Amino acid sequence: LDAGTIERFLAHSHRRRYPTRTDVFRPGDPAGTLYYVISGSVSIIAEEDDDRELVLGYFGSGEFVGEMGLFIESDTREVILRTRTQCELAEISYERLQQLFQTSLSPDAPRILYAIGVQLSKRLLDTTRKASRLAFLDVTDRIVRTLHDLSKEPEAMSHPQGTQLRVSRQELARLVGCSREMAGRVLKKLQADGLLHARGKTVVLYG
Amino acid sequence: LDAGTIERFLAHSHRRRYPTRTDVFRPGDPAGTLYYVISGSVSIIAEEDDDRELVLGYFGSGEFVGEMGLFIESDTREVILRTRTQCELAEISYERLQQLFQTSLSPDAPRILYAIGVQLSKRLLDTTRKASRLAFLDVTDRIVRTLHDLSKEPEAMSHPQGTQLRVSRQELARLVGCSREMAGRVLKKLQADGLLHARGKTVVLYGT
Known part of the structure; x- marks a missing residue:
């Protein structure tokens, strides 16, 4: 167009x-x-x-x-x-x-x-x-793939450890059809896994 | 067009x-x-x-x-x-x-x-x-909904009990996104609940 x-x-x-x-x-x-x-x-x-x-x-x-x-x-x-x-x-x-x-x-x-x-x-x-x-x-796999799509969006602000996304526990929950708490639980597992860290509405995806 | x-x-x-x-x-x-x-x-x-x-x-x-x-x-x-x-x-x-x-x-x-x-x-x-x-x-829930969508399919061959819908257990599971097996478990549970007859390859949905 x-x-x-x-x-x-x-x-x-x-x-x-x-x-x-x-x-x-x-x-x-x-x-x-x-x-x-x-x-x-x-x-x-x-x-x-x-x-x-x-x-x-x-x-x-x-x-x-x-x-x-x-x-x-x-x-x-x-x-x-x-x-x-x-x-x-x-x-x-x-x-x-x-x-x-x-x-x-x-x-x-x-x-x-x-x-x-x-x-x-x-x-x-x-x-x-x-x-x-x-x-x-499973919800973990839907969340990881979703965090990776989000990081492919032009909106994905760069970070020294990878890509700094902008998502909240609520939205994440809305994107993969899971409860807010479950999304919160999956995030702490991935962090503990060393794949990323989070803060309020800021998720730093490593890569 | x-x-x-x-x-x-x-x-x-x-x-x-x-x-x-x-x-x-x-x-x-x-x-x-x-x-x-x-x-x-x-x-x-x-x-x-x-x-x-x-x-x-x-x-x-x-x-x-x-x-x-x-x-x-x-x-x-x-x-x-x-x-x-x-x-x-x-x-x-x-x-x-x-x-x-x-x-x-x-x-x-x-x-x-x-x-x-x-x-x-x-x-x-x-x-x-x-x-x-x-x-x-839920699975059972999705399967019921999908059974009714097909009843309205031009294929749906009316039956004295309800409607004769030819849908393999495999296709049903592919339709609702569940294992071919689980799809079976629900077809039998519905054959018990009195609302359809799991006839080998076809399904006779009682009612509509």
Whole structure:
């Protein structure tokens, strides 16, 4: 997706600023708009009947979210979109967007569509891998592999002993579907194992 | 996408018949081809290390499979594409697709990409749900849910007791992500609980 296509698409979008820890939408909310992350980071979370959460991923600038309704006929969202930092999001209704595809943005339709396909593909892969790990790996193995993915993210701040990640016991718990305490227990085992050390929301992964 | 866009798309594809139980491609194989299911039923399976499989879904006529490499430049496949029945699949290389997307197929590009988008979105939603289930629901619980999903499968052959759903113990375990054995333990416990009959290769779910 080139700079022109992006700017042309954003001209018809509505830019809004969001504080951190803010749910942009939750399961059941009207599904009529598409969001484009201009700045900041957000997370997509699956919710359960007992209010238990499964974090599916983190998304930054250039990512389209709340896009499902643009492809699947539905009056409601199926997940929670939450801000992890202060955010700026551009939004545009599905109707308006598709209208633009038949006219104004007619030329960029293929590019915007392909780009959304790129993200959906990445997401399907990661989610496909999260499903596999949830079915065949113990919590310790899910946590180690998760700490290693997190350290591959551009957000991974370097450290003299390896990579300095930024995760809390709660989020870790949310990422691998285990209790907060279990995540806390696994962290002290890995530290005792010499694979890393932790401090509040700072995990220093060795490597 | 219309039948007109579909036919032109196939005009450049190589249709090949596949026997049932044939893994069209496994993780590791080259990924320079896209597949379009013309007829038949296939399954997308993911593998782990302990040599375990998790069915992520079944797909019929009209489905684009093996499409990942068309979006995420990769040299290899990440999943197993396995025919569940005899199938007719039309394949086309990625390279020749986008070259076509810039030539006689440029006008079809929008509808093609969007259709693939629709399919990617359904699988994402379905897999997202699976992960959620594999995280918070128990085996027996997941198996019951999956038994009902198949009852609504066009295959579901109605029965005087309920519905006759042909699903091997192996596939059940691959569906809910449990050992072929454990899956058995629950099929018998459900054959006791009075709600289904574990008939060798088939399952008669009482009720629905």
